[PDB]
Structure 1
């Protein structure tokens, strides 16, 4: 009765366009009279190892970028580069543009992803920005340009644009000003995701979700200090817990009457003695892709 929920994708579906440059097609985002898309759309098949993007873009004209919004083709009247994004000024302003904002998210935070291919939305799902700045997405060839987003009231907050797959099958991209999450670059190199860790804030939020949904078997009578917990957390590749996290879990702690450091003693016991065949909220592992905000929303 508790699961990954994506935001309704209608407001973003209206802004999804196709952007073709030579032999390469990928998705872009059309807000007002601008189309944002990954700049590597101008990289050539021969030049994937060491492209110089300033160089490749001086050589382009407006007419080298085909932009198709569904049936209707848009005419480009200008172009520029912002970090790893390209900005294409088009003639028409998108009539379906929503109230929107560009935000840079932090590790642990979650968002919905609209997976698109050739400008055509195909799927929506929820995921989290990992601590190693990758995302565990479901992106196939030509998903580049797909965006990730959160919706509050009527206001879309774009936080991610997809650029590339890394060798482990996870994914890298940028915010909507083109700055990458993590130390990744939009070329073919030998770059790997660094070692990942488990998002302690999110596990604790989930245990509080489980308690609120009536499952309570993992609770215990013990307490722990923050330092005592962080020694167990380091052994099990979990992010250290901070006072800031303890503060964030306040409202959840009040609702259930279970002190945060009590919940931490509970989690520490789970990490040391396994789950021995039981299930939490339907899971047999410790979920770390729900935030404190996500749990309250559900």
Structure 2
């Protein structure tokens, strides 16, 4: 069948640590001799206050533990890189894998390893939406949880949790310390970009339905529409211009011959399905549906 595929959290679990600073506690990941955690554990500051507030944070206050290895690390250097803190410790993590800090483009998926007190409690699947927010699930003390993927032996880190917004949305930074979207780690109302459907993922979801549930459903459109006529419709109906990624076409084309339904009909079905309308319609990437 066709399922939402997640990446095994084992390599991330061995690197997770807990970071507690003067009553505030969150999570952090431990790679080589550096621990990466959100900067707001030292306090809730704004704008350019961070440089100076990090400069006076004494390392003896950074209590860092890695429960899965039963060792308490000692901080020696503290450096702010973006909106993250790089905590240099004496002990090198023997469980460090070959990794890479890869930034996500909107529409791509990743595995969140939701962690509390330095221990991963849940893992689940999210996709970065065009508003640069993820629709996830976090409670107090979850900041520092990472979103990742895996390509063979290499851990690809994409995300670290920072803040939750009113409409059940979440934003954080990449492991280089830069937020996704115009969002910051400040507890104020922040304007969001209007939502837009990642069209390639909507098309991938419908094809997954025809390949597993029903080869010919009733709501499927009988007539085609051109990509051009769809893209003119999409510019006024909050749908992204198709195709979002030119590299998704070889997947979608292969999916359409497997399903014996040209993408023109799927696009038309998307337009006809606007009668029936957060939404969760873009969790299925064309790669994940085609490869499996």
Whether these two folds match at TM > 0.5 is yes
Deviation at 1:21, TM superposition (A): 1.4
Between the aligned partners of 2:287 and 2:98, the Cα distance in structure 1 is 22
**Residue 181 of structure 1 aligns to a residue in which SS?**
coil
Between the aligned partners of 2:132 and 2:28, the Cα distance in structure 1 is 22
The answer as to 2:100 corresponding to 1:66 is: no
**Residue 270 of structure 1 aligns to a residue in which SS?**
helix
CA contact (8 A) 2:113 2:145 kept: yes
**What residue number does 2:33 align with?**
33
Q: What TM-score do you get using the length of structure 1 for normalisation?
A: 0.88
Kindly report which structure 2 residues correspond to 1:1-150, keeping only aligned pairs within 5 A, or say none.
2-44=2-44, 48=45, 52-70=49-67, 71-150=70-149
Deviation at 1:220, TM superposition (A): 4.1
Between the aligned partners of 1:172 and 1:116, the Cα distance in structure 2 is 16
**What residue number does 1:224 align with?**
225
Which runs of at least 4 in structure 1 moved beyond 6 Å after TM superposition?
A: none
Deviation at 1:17, TM superposition (A): 0.2
The answer as to 2:286 corresponding to 1:295 is: no
Residues 231-250 of structure 1 show CA distances to partners (whole Å, capped at 9, x for unaligned) of 43345422222372545523
**Residue 270 of structure 2 aligns to a residue in which SS?**
helix
Q: Structure 1: which 5+ runs fail to align?
A: 276-284
Kindly report which structure 2 residues correspond to 1:272-283, keeping only aligned pairs within 5 A, or say none.
272=275, 274=276
**Residue 258 of structure 2 aligns to a residue in which SS?**
helix
Between the aligned partners of 1:3 and 1:197, the Cα distance in structure 2 is 24
**What residue number does 2:267 align with?**
264
Residues 24-54 of structure 1 show CA distances to partners (whole Å, capped at 9, x for unaligned) of 111000011110001111125xxx4567111
Q: What TM-score do you get using the length of structure 2 for normalisation?
A: 0.89
CA contact (8 A) 1:51 1:187 kept: no
More deviation, 243-252/106-115:
243-252
**Residue 20 of structure 1 aligns to a residue in which SS?**
strand
Between the aligned partners of 2:260 and 2:157, the Cα distance in structure 1 is 35
Q: How many equivalent residue pairs?
A: 285
Between the aligned partners of 1:286 and 1:53, the Cα distance in structure 2 is 35
Deviation at 1:286, TM superposition (A): 7.4
Residues 181-211 of structure 1 show CA distances to partners (whole Å, capped at 9, x for unaligned) of 0001122232133221222111101111122
Distance verdict in 2 for CA 1:286–1:223, change over 3 Å: farther
Distance verdict in 2 for CA 1:286–1:117, change over 3 Å: closer
Between the aligned partners of 1:258 and 1:209, the Cα distance in structure 2 is 12
Task: Select which of 244, 253, 269 maps to 2:256.
Answer: 253
Between the aligned partners of 1:258 and 1:199, the Cα distance in structure 2 is 20
Between the aligned partners of 2:155 and 2:178, the Cα distance in structure 1 is 19
Deviation at 1:67, TM superposition (A): 0.6
**What residue number does 2:234 align with?**
233
CA contact (8 A) 2:107 2:198 kept: yes
Between the aligned partners of 2:280 and 2:25, the Cα distance in structure 1 is 39
**Residue 249 of structure 1 aligns to a residue in which SS?**
helix
Deviation at 1:116, TM superposition (A): 0.7
Between the aligned partners of 1:169 and 1:264, the Cα distance in structure 2 is 29
Between the aligned partners of 1:7 and 1:242, the Cα distance in structure 2 is 26
Between the aligned partners of 2:291 and 2:7, the Cα distance in structure 1 is 11
